[PDB]
Coordinates of C-alpha atoms in Angstrom, one line a residue:
Chain A
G127 CA -61.8 43.6 -39.0
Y128 CA -63.1 42.6 -35.4
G129 CA -61.0 39.9 -33.6
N130 CA -62.2 37.5 -31.5
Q131 CA -64.9 37.6 -28.8
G132 CA -63.7 35.0 -26.2
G133 CA -63.4 31.4 -25.4
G134 CA -61.5 28.9 -23.1
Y135 CA -58.1 30.1 -25.4
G136 CA -59.2 32.7 -27.1
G137 CA -56.5 33.1 -29.9
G138 CA -56.2 36.1 -32.2
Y139 CA -55.6 36.9 -35.8
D140 CA -52.2 35.2 -35.6
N141 CA -50.1 34.9 -38.7
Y142 CA -47.2 32.1 -38.5
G143 CA -46.0 31.6 -42.0
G144 CA -46.4 33.5 -45.1
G145 CA -44.3 36.5 -47.0
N146 CA -43.1 36.3 -50.7
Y147 CA -40.1 34.0 -50.9
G148 CA -38.9 34.8 -54.0
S149 CA -41.7 36.6 -55.6
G150 CA -42.4 39.8 -57.2
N151 CA -39.1 40.2 -59.1
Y152 CA -38.8 42.3 -62.2
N153 CA -36.2 40.2 -64.3
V154 CA -34.4 41.2 -67.3
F155 CA -31.7 39.1 -67.8
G156 CA -29.4 38.6 -71.1
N157 CA -27.6 35.4 -72.3
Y158 CA -25.6 33.3 -69.9
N159 CA -27.4 34.3 -66.2
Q160 CA -28.1 32.1 -63.2
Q161 CA -30.9 33.3 -60.7
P162 CA -31.0 30.0 -58.2
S163 CA -33.0 30.1 -55.1
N164 CA -33.3 27.5 -52.7
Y165 CA -35.3 27.0 -49.2
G166 CA -34.8 25.4 -46.0
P167 CA -37.7 23.5 -44.2
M168 CA -40.3 25.5 -42.7
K169 CA -42.2 25.0 -39.7
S170 CA -45.3 27.6 -38.8
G171 CA -47.1 26.7 -36.3
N172 CA -47.4 25.4 -32.5
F173 CA -45.0 22.3 -32.1
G174 CA -44.0 20.1 -29.3
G175 CA -48.0 19.9 -27.8
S176 CA -47.5 24.3 -27.2
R177 CA -51.0 26.0 -26.4
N178 CA -51.8 23.2 -24.4
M179 CA -54.7 23.7 -21.4
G180 CA -54.3 21.7 -18.0
Chain B
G8 CA -58.7 47.2 -36.9
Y9 CA -60.2 45.8 -33.5
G10 CA -58.2 43.3 -31.4
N11 CA -59.6 40.4 -29.3
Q12 CA -61.8 41.2 -26.7
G13 CA -60.9 38.3 -24.2
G14 CA -61.0 34.7 -23.1
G15 CA -59.1 32.0 -21.1
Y16 CA -55.3 33.1 -22.8
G17 CA -56.3 36.1 -25.2
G18 CA -53.6 36.1 -27.8
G19 CA -52.9 39.0 -29.7
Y20 CA -52.3 39.6 -33.3
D21 CA -49.3 38.0 -33.8
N22 CA -46.8 38.0 -36.7
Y23 CA -44.2 35.3 -35.9
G24 CA -42.8 35.0 -39.2
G25 CA -43.3 36.7 -42.9
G26 CA -41.8 39.5 -45.1
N27 CA -40.1 39.4 -48.3
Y28 CA -37.0 36.7 -48.9
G29 CA -35.3 37.4 -52.1
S30 CA -38.1 39.4 -53.5
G31 CA -39.6 42.6 -55.2
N32 CA -36.4 42.9 -57.1
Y33 CA -35.7 45.0 -59.8
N34 CA -32.7 43.1 -61.9
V35 CA -31.2 44.0 -64.9
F36 CA -28.7 41.3 -65.8
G37 CA -26.0 41.3 -69.1
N38 CA -24.1 38.2 -69.7
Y39 CA -22.7 35.9 -67.4
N40 CA -24.0 36.8 -63.8
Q41 CA -24.9 34.5 -60.9
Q42 CA -27.5 35.5 -57.6
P43 CA -27.9 32.3 -56.0
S44 CA -29.8 32.5 -52.8
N45 CA -30.1 29.6 -49.9
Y46 CA -32.0 30.1 -47.0
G47 CA -31.4 27.9 -43.8
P48 CA -34.8 26.2 -41.4
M49 CA -36.9 28.9 -40.5
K50 CA -39.5 27.9 -36.8
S51 CA -42.3 30.4 -36.8
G52 CA -44.5 29.8 -33.6
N53 CA -44.5 28.2 -30.2
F54 CA -41.9 25.5 -29.9
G55 CA -41.2 22.9 -26.8
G56 CA -44.8 23.0 -25.4
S57 CA -44.8 26.9 -25.1
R58 CA -48.0 29.2 -24.7
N59 CA -49.5 26.6 -21.9
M60 CA -51.7 26.6 -19.1
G61 CA -51.2 24.9 -16.1
Chain C
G866 CA -55.5 50.0 -34.4
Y867 CA -56.7 49.0 -31.4
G868 CA -55.2 46.4 -29.6
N869 CA -56.3 43.3 -27.7
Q870 CA -58.6 44.3 -24.8
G871 CA -58.3 41.4 -21.9
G872 CA -57.8 38.1 -21.4
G873 CA -56.0 35.4 -19.1
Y874 CA -52.4 36.4 -20.4
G875 CA -53.4 38.8 -23.0
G876 CA -50.6 39.1 -25.8
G877 CA -50.2 42.1 -27.3
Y878 CA -49.2 43.2 -31.2
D879 CA -45.8 40.9 -31.5
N880 CA -44.0 40.9 -34.2
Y881 CA -41.4 38.1 -33.6
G882 CA -39.5 37.8 -36.9
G883 CA -40.1 39.5 -40.0
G884 CA -38.6 42.1 -42.8
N885 CA -36.8 42.6 -46.4
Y886 CA -34.4 39.3 -46.9
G887 CA -32.5 40.8 -49.7
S888 CA -35.5 42.1 -50.9
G889 CA -36.4 45.7 -52.5
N890 CA -32.6 45.4 -54.8
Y891 CA -32.1 47.6 -57.6
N892 CA -29.5 45.7 -59.3
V893 CA -28.0 46.4 -63.1
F894 CA -25.3 43.8 -63.3
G895 CA -23.0 43.9 -66.4
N896 CA -20.9 40.7 -67.9
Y897 CA -19.4 38.3 -65.0
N898 CA -21.0 39.3 -61.6
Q899 CA -21.5 37.4 -58.4
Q900 CA -24.3 38.4 -55.8
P901 CA -24.8 35.2 -53.6
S902 CA -26.6 35.4 -50.3
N903 CA -27.0 32.8 -47.9
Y904 CA -29.1 33.1 -44.2
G905 CA -28.8 30.7 -41.3
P906 CA -31.9 29.3 -39.6
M907 CA -34.3 31.6 -38.0
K908 CA -36.0 30.8 -35.2
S909 CA -39.2 33.3 -34.2
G910 CA -41.6 32.9 -31.3
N911 CA -41.6 31.4 -27.6
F912 CA -39.4 28.5 -27.0
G913 CA -38.3 26.0 -24.5
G914 CA -41.9 26.2 -22.9
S915 CA -42.0 29.7 -23.0
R916 CA -45.1 32.1 -21.8
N917 CA -46.7 29.2 -19.4
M918 CA -49.5 29.6 -16.7
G919 CA -48.6 28.1 -13.8
Chain D
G1073 CA -64.7 41.0 -41.2
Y1074 CA -65.9 39.8 -38.1
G1075 CA -64.1 36.9 -35.8
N1076 CA -65.2 33.9 -33.5
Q1077 CA -67.4 35.1 -30.9
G1078 CA -66.7 32.0 -28.6
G1079 CA -66.3 28.3 -27.6
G1080 CA -65.0 25.9 -25.6
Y1081 CA -61.4 26.7 -27.4
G1082 CA -61.7 29.9 -29.3
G1083 CA -59.1 29.5 -32.0
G1084 CA -59.2 32.6 -34.2
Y1085 CA -58.5 33.6 -37.7
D1086 CA -55.2 32.0 -37.4
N1087 CA -53.0 31.8 -40.4
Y1088 CA -50.7 28.8 -40.6
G1089 CA -48.7 28.5 -44.1
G1090 CA -49.4 30.9 -47.7
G1091 CA -47.7 33.7 -49.7
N1092 CA -46.2 33.2 -52.8
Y1093 CA -43.4 30.6 -53.3
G1094 CA -41.7 32.1 -56.5
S1095 CA -44.7 33.8 -58.3
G1096 CA -45.9 36.9 -59.5
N1097 CA -42.7 37.4 -61.6
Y1098 CA -41.9 39.4 -64.6
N1099 CA -39.6 37.8 -66.6
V1100 CA -37.6 38.6 -70.1
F1101 CA -35.0 36.2 -70.5
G1102 CA -32.7 35.8 -73.5
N1103 CA -30.6 32.9 -75.2
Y1104 CA -29.3 30.6 -72.3
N1105 CA -30.8 31.5 -68.8
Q1106 CA -31.6 29.5 -66.1
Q1107 CA -33.7 30.3 -62.6
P1108 CA -34.3 27.6 -60.5
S1109 CA -36.1 27.3 -57.2
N1110 CA -36.2 24.4 -54.3
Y1111 CA -38.5 24.1 -51.4
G1112 CA -37.8 22.5 -48.6
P1113 CA -40.7 20.6 -46.7
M1114 CA -43.1 22.9 -45.3
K1115 CA -45.2 22.3 -42.1
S1116 CA -47.8 24.3 -41.0
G1117 CA -50.1 24.1 -38.4
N1118 CA -50.2 22.0 -35.0
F1119 CA -47.7 19.6 -34.2
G1120 CA -47.4 17.0 -31.5
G1121 CA -50.5 17.0 -30.2
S1122 CA -50.5 20.8 -30.0
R1123 CA -53.6 23.2 -28.6
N1124 CA -55.0 19.8 -26.8
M1125 CA -57.4 20.5 -23.6
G1126 CA -57.2 18.3 -20.9
Chain E
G77 CA -67.4 37.8 -43.2
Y78 CA -69.2 36.5 -39.8
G79 CA -66.9 33.7 -38.2
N80 CA -68.3 30.7 -35.9
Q81 CA -70.4 31.7 -32.6
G82 CA -69.9 28.5 -30.6
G83 CA -69.0 25.2 -29.6
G84 CA -67.1 22.6 -27.9
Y85 CA -63.8 23.8 -29.7
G86 CA -65.1 26.8 -31.9
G87 CA -62.7 26.8 -34.2
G88 CA -62.2 29.9 -36.4
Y89 CA -61.3 30.7 -39.8
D90 CA -57.8 28.5 -40.2
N91 CA -56.1 29.2 -43.5
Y92 CA -53.5 26.1 -43.0
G93 CA -51.6 26.1 -46.3
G94 CA -52.0 28.1 -49.4
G95 CA -51.0 30.6 -51.7
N96 CA -49.5 30.5 -55.2
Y97 CA -46.1 28.0 -55.5
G98 CA -44.8 29.0 -58.7
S99 CA -48.2 30.8 -60.0
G100 CA -49.3 34.0 -61.8
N101 CA -45.7 34.2 -63.9
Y102 CA -45.2 37.1 -67.0
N103 CA -42.4 34.9 -69.0
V104 CA -40.8 36.1 -72.0
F105 CA -38.1 33.3 -72.8
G106 CA -35.4 33.2 -75.9
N107 CA -34.0 30.5 -77.1
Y108 CA -32.4 27.8 -74.5
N109 CA -33.6 28.6 -70.8
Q110 CA -34.2 27.1 -67.9
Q111 CA -36.6 27.4 -65.0
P112 CA -37.3 24.6 -63.2
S113 CA -39.4 24.1 -59.6
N114 CA -39.3 21.9 -57.1
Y115 CA -41.3 21.4 -54.1
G116 CA -40.6 19.2 -50.7
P117 CA -43.4 17.7 -48.7
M118 CA -46.6 20.2 -47.8
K119 CA -48.4 19.1 -44.5
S120 CA -50.5 21.6 -43.5
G121 CA -53.4 21.1 -40.7
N122 CA -53.6 19.2 -37.2
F123 CA -51.1 16.6 -36.9
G124 CA -49.8 13.8 -33.9
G125 CA -53.2 13.7 -32.1
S126 CA -53.5 18.2 -32.0
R127 CA -56.5 19.8 -30.9
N128 CA -57.9 16.8 -28.8
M129 CA -60.4 17.3 -26.0
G130 CA -60.4 15.3 -23.1
Chain F
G122 CA -0.3 4.8 -54.8
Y123 CA 0.9 5.7 -58.1
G124 CA -0.2 9.0 -59.4
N125 CA -0.9 10.1 -63.0
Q126 CA 2.4 9.6 -65.4
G127 CA 1.9 12.5 -68.2
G128 CA -0.7 15.0 -69.9
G129 CA -1.6 18.2 -71.5
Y130 CA -2.6 19.9 -67.8
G131 CA -1.3 16.4 -65.3
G132 CA -3.7 16.7 -62.8
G133 CA -3.6 15.0 -59.2
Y134 CA -5.3 13.7 -56.5
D135 CA -6.8 16.5 -56.1
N136 CA -9.5 16.1 -52.8
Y137 CA -11.9 19.4 -52.9
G138 CA -14.6 18.4 -50.6
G139 CA -15.8 15.4 -48.5
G140 CA -14.5 14.4 -44.6
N141 CA -17.7 13.8 -42.0
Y142 CA -20.6 16.4 -41.6
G143 CA -21.5 15.8 -38.3
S144 CA -21.5 12.1 -38.6
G145 CA -19.0 9.4 -36.2
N146 CA -20.9 10.4 -32.8
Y147 CA -21.8 8.2 -30.4
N148 CA -24.6 10.0 -28.6
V149 CA -26.4 8.9 -25.2
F150 CA -29.3 11.3 -25.7
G151 CA -32.1 11.0 -22.4
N152 CA -35.6 12.9 -22.1
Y153 CA -35.6 16.5 -23.6
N154 CA -32.8 17.2 -26.1
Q155 CA -32.1 19.1 -29.0
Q156 CA -29.2 18.5 -31.4
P157 CA -29.6 20.2 -34.5
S158 CA -27.6 20.6 -37.3
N159 CA -27.3 22.9 -40.5
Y160 CA -24.4 23.5 -43.4
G161 CA -24.5 26.0 -45.7
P162 CA -24.0 25.7 -49.6
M163 CA -21.0 23.7 -50.5
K164 CA -18.6 24.4 -53.6
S165 CA -16.2 22.1 -54.1
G166 CA -14.2 22.0 -57.6
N167 CA -13.2 24.8 -60.3
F168 CA -15.1 27.9 -60.6
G169 CA -15.3 30.4 -63.1
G170 CA -13.5 29.0 -65.7
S171 CA -10.6 27.6 -63.3
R172 CA -7.8 25.0 -65.1
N173 CA -8.2 26.7 -68.5
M174 CA -5.7 25.9 -71.1
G175 CA -5.3 28.8 -73.7
Chain G
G407 CA -3.5 2.0 -57.3
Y408 CA -2.1 3.0 -60.9
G409 CA -3.3 6.7 -62.3
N410 CA -3.6 7.9 -66.0
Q411 CA -0.6 7.6 -68.0
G412 CA -1.0 10.2 -70.6
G413 CA -3.3 12.7 -72.8
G414 CA -4.3 15.3 -74.0
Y415 CA -5.6 16.7 -70.6
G416 CA -4.6 14.4 -68.2
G417 CA -6.8 14.6 -65.3
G418 CA -5.9 13.0 -62.2
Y419 CA -8.0 10.9 -59.3
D420 CA -9.7 14.0 -58.6
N421 CA -12.4 13.8 -55.4
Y422 CA -14.8 16.7 -55.9
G423 CA -17.6 15.5 -53.5
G424 CA -18.4 13.1 -50.6
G425 CA -17.9 11.7 -47.6
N426 CA -19.8 11.2 -44.7
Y427 CA -23.2 13.7 -44.0
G428 CA -24.9 12.4 -40.5
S429 CA -23.9 9.0 -41.2
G430 CA -22.3 6.3 -39.2
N431 CA -23.9 7.6 -36.1
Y432 CA -24.5 5.2 -32.7
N433 CA -27.8 7.0 -31.4
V434 CA -29.6 6.2 -27.7
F435 CA -32.3 8.4 -27.5
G436 CA -34.8 8.2 -24.9
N437 CA -38.5 10.3 -24.3
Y438 CA -38.6 13.6 -26.2
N439 CA -35.2 14.0 -28.1
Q440 CA -34.8 16.2 -31.4
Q441 CA -32.0 15.8 -33.7
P442 CA -32.4 17.7 -36.9
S443 CA -30.1 18.0 -39.9
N444 CA -30.3 20.6 -42.8
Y445 CA -27.7 21.0 -45.9
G446 CA -27.8 23.8 -48.3
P447 CA -26.9 23.3 -52.2
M448 CA -23.7 21.3 -52.9
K449 CA -22.0 22.0 -55.7
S450 CA -19.0 19.2 -56.5
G451 CA -17.1 19.1 -59.9
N452 CA -16.1 21.8 -63.1
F453 CA -18.3 24.8 -62.9
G454 CA -18.5 28.2 -65.4
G455 CA -16.6 26.4 -68.3
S456 CA -13.8 25.2 -66.4
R457 CA -11.0 23.2 -67.4
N458 CA -11.6 23.8 -71.4
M459 CA -8.8 23.4 -73.8
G460 CA -8.4 26.8 -76.1
Chain H
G1471 CA -6.9 -0.7 -60.3
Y1472 CA -5.0 0.6 -63.2
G1473 CA -6.3 3.7 -64.8
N1474 CA -6.3 4.9 -68.5
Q1475 CA -3.6 5.2 -71.0
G1476 CA -4.3 7.9 -73.5
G1477 CA -6.5 10.1 -75.1
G1478 CA -7.9 13.0 -76.6
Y1479 CA -8.8 14.3 -73.3
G1480 CA -7.6 11.7 -71.2
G1481 CA -10.2 12.0 -67.8
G1482 CA -9.0 9.9 -64.7
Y1483 CA -11.1 8.5 -62.4
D1484 CA -13.0 11.2 -60.8
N1485 CA -15.8 10.9 -57.9
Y1486 CA -17.7 14.0 -58.7
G1487 CA -20.6 13.2 -56.1
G1488 CA -20.9 10.7 -53.6
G1489 CA -20.9 9.4 -49.9
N1490 CA -23.2 8.5 -47.1
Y1491 CA -26.2 10.8 -46.9
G1492 CA -27.8 10.1 -43.4
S1493 CA -27.0 6.3 -43.8
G1494 CA -24.9 3.5 -42.1
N1495 CA -26.8 4.8 -38.5
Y1496 CA -27.1 2.7 -35.5
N1497 CA -30.6 4.5 -34.0
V1498 CA -31.9 3.1 -30.6
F1499 CA -35.0 5.5 -30.2
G1500 CA -37.5 5.5 -26.8
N1501 CA -41.1 6.7 -27.1
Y1502 CA -41.7 10.3 -28.8
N1503 CA -38.5 11.1 -31.1
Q1504 CA -38.1 13.2 -34.0
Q1505 CA -34.9 12.4 -36.0
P1506 CA -35.3 14.9 -39.3
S1507 CA -33.3 15.1 -42.3
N1508 CA -33.2 17.5 -45.1
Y1509 CA -31.2 17.8 -48.0
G1510 CA -30.4 20.3 -51.2
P1511 CA -30.7 20.1 -54.3
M1512 CA -27.1 18.3 -55.9
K1513 CA -24.8 19.0 -58.7
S1514 CA -22.0 16.3 -59.3
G1515 CA -20.2 16.9 -62.6
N1516 CA -19.7 18.9 -65.0
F1517 CA -21.5 22.6 -66.0
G1518 CA -22.1 25.3 -68.1
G1519 CA -19.6 23.5 -71.3
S1520 CA -17.0 22.6 -68.6
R1521 CA -14.6 20.3 -69.4
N1522 CA -14.9 21.5 -73.7
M1523 CA -11.9 21.4 -76.2
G1524 CA -11.2 24.3 -78.8
Chain I
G683 CA -9.6 -3.2 -63.0
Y684 CA -8.0 -1.9 -66.5
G685 CA -9.3 1.5 -67.4
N686 CA -9.6 2.4 -71.2
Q687 CA -6.8 2.5 -73.5
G688 CA -7.5 5.3 -76.1
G689 CA -9.7 7.3 -77.8
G690 CA -10.7 11.0 -79.4
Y691 CA -11.7 11.9 -75.6
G692 CA -10.8 8.8 -73.4
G693 CA -12.8 9.9 -70.6
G694 CA -12.1 7.6 -67.3
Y695 CA -14.3 5.5 -65.0
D696 CA -15.9 8.4 -63.6
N697 CA -18.4 8.2 -60.8
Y698 CA -21.1 11.4 -60.9
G699 CA -23.7 10.4 -58.6
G700 CA -24.5 7.4 -56.3
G701 CA -23.7 6.4 -52.5
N702 CA -26.3 5.4 -49.8
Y703 CA -28.9 8.0 -48.9
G704 CA -30.7 7.3 -45.6
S705 CA -29.8 3.4 -46.4
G706 CA -28.0 0.7 -44.0
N707 CA -29.7 1.9 -41.3
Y708 CA -29.9 -0.4 -37.7
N709 CA -33.0 1.2 -36.6
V710 CA -34.8 0.2 -32.9
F711 CA -38.1 2.3 -32.8
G712 CA -40.2 2.3 -30.0
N713 CA -44.1 4.1 -29.7
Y714 CA -44.3 7.8 -31.4
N715 CA -41.4 8.1 -33.1
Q716 CA -40.7 10.2 -36.8
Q717 CA -37.5 9.5 -38.8
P718 CA -38.7 11.5 -41.8
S719 CA -36.1 12.5 -45.1
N720 CA -36.1 14.6 -47.9
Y721 CA -33.5 15.1 -50.6
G722 CA -33.7 18.0 -53.1
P723 CA -33.4 17.6 -56.9
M724 CA -30.0 15.5 -58.1
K725 CA -28.1 16.3 -61.2
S726 CA -25.4 14.0 -61.8
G727 CA -23.6 13.9 -65.1
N728 CA -22.7 16.8 -68.0
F729 CA -24.9 19.8 -68.4
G730 CA -24.9 22.5 -70.7
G731 CA -23.1 21.0 -73.9
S732 CA -20.2 20.0 -71.5
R733 CA -17.3 17.7 -72.3
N734 CA -17.9 19.1 -76.1
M735 CA -15.4 18.5 -79.0
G736 CA -14.6 21.6 -81.6
Chain J
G360 CA -12.2 -5.8 -65.7
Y361 CA -10.7 -4.4 -69.0
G362 CA -12.4 -0.9 -70.2
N363 CA -12.5 -0.1 -73.4
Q364 CA -10.1 0.2 -76.5
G365 CA -10.8 3.0 -78.9
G366 CA -13.1 5.5 -80.3
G367 CA -14.0 8.2 -82.2
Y368 CA -15.2 9.4 -78.7
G369 CA -13.9 6.4 -76.1
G370 CA -16.3 6.8 -73.3
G371 CA -15.2 4.7 -70.4
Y372 CA -17.0 3.1 -67.3
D373 CA -19.0 6.1 -66.6
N374 CA -21.5 5.7 -63.3
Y375 CA -23.9 8.6 -63.7
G376 CA -26.5 7.6 -61.5
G377 CA -27.5 4.7 -58.8
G378 CA -26.8 3.7 -54.8
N379 CA -29.3 2.7 -52.3
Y380 CA -32.3 5.2 -51.7
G381 CA -33.4 4.3 -48.6
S382 CA -32.5 1.0 -49.1
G383 CA -30.6 -1.8 -47.5
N384 CA -32.9 -1.2 -43.9
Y385 CA -32.7 -3.0 -40.0
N386 CA -36.3 -2.0 -38.8
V387 CA -38.0 -2.9 -36.0
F388 CA -40.5 -0.6 -35.4
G389 CA -43.1 -0.7 -32.3
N390 CA -46.5 0.8 -32.2
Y391 CA -47.0 4.4 -34.1
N392 CA -43.9 5.1 -36.2
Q393 CA -43.5 6.9 -39.2
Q394 CA -40.7 6.7 -41.7
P395 CA -41.4 8.8 -44.6
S396 CA -39.4 9.3 -47.4
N397 CA -39.1 11.6 -50.1
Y398 CA -36.9 12.4 -52.9
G399 CA -36.5 15.4 -55.6
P400 CA -36.5 14.9 -59.3
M401 CA -33.1 13.2 -60.7
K402 CA -31.1 13.8 -64.0
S403 CA -28.3 11.3 -64.5
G404 CA -26.2 11.8 -68.0
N405 CA -25.3 14.2 -70.3
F406 CA -28.1 17.2 -70.9
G407 CA -28.2 20.1 -72.8
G408 CA -26.1 18.5 -76.1
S409 CA -23.2 17.4 -74.0
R410 CA -20.6 15.2 -75.2
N411 CA -20.7 16.4 -78.7
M412 CA -18.5 16.3 -81.9
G413 CA -18.3 18.9 -83.9

């Protein structure tokens, strides 16, 4: 539980993308049921030259 | 539970994207049921050259 | 439970995007039911060159 | 539970992409049921020359 | 549980891509059931000349 | 340009879903521009046992 | 250009789903431009036992 | 250009799914440009026992 | 251009799935460009015991 | 251009799956360009005991 001490940029404990997507369900389905699930594109992180040092 | 000490930028414990998306459900479905779920694109983080150092 | 000490920018415990989206439900559905759910694009974080250092 | 000490960039314990995608489910399905799941492209990390050093 | 000490770049314990994709399920299926699962392309890591040193 | 003559139901020239979605554009973009476009789920046709004959 | 004459159901020239999705564009892009496009699930046709005959 | 004459069901010239998806483009791209395109699942036709005869 | 005459079901000239997916493009790309394209699962036709005769 | 005359089921000129997928392109690419293309599973035809005769 100890973070980073030092550095030129010194990034921390960053959580960009995660979690449960349609997970951990308790399902009791009878006969004719539909449970679709659709997810779009996910971008987690640094984009377009981000977190750059001059 | 200790964060970052120091650094050139010194970012912290940043949570950009996460959580439960259609998760942790208790479902009892009988006969003809529909439970669709659609999610758009997700961008979590730094974009367009963000958090840059001159 | 201790935040960041110091740094050039010194960002904190920032929560940008999260939470439960259609999650943690208790559902008892009988016969012909519909429970759709649609979410638009989500942008969580820093955009357009934000949090930059001159 | 000890992070990085130092360095030229000093990146931390970054979690870019992860979590459960349609996982950890308890499913009791009877007769004619459909549970589709579709996920778009996922980009986790640093893109477009991000986290560069001048 | 000890991270990296030092270096020219000093990258940390980065988790780019992982987690359970349609895994760890408890499934009891009777008669005519469909549980498809489709995943798009996944890019985990550094792309476009990222994390470069001048 | 002649429609249907007869039948038990006698459906016509029905146009359910169509048209240009972000199409036929003339675009002159200079330098740093963004033109995103996101569309939700589209249902075109007859649903829930519609157009049934007793 | 002559439709259907007769039949037990006598369906016509039905157009359920079609058209240009992000098509037929004239694009002149200079330097750093983004033109993303995301489309949700599309259902075109007859669903849920539609157009049935007793 | 002559449709169907007769039959037990007498379906016509039905167009369920089609059209140009990100097609027929004129593109002049200079230097660093991104033009992504993502499409969800497409269902074209008759589903759930549709167009059945008793 | 003459359709079907008769039959027990008498299906017509049905077009279920087709068209140009990222096709027929005129592309002039210079230097560092990305044009990704991702398509989800496509179902064209009759599903779930559709177009059945009693 | 003459369809089927008759029969027990009398199916017509059905086009289930086809078309150009990333085809017929005119491409002039200079230096460092990426044009990926990914397609999901495609199901064209009759599924789940469809078009059955009692």
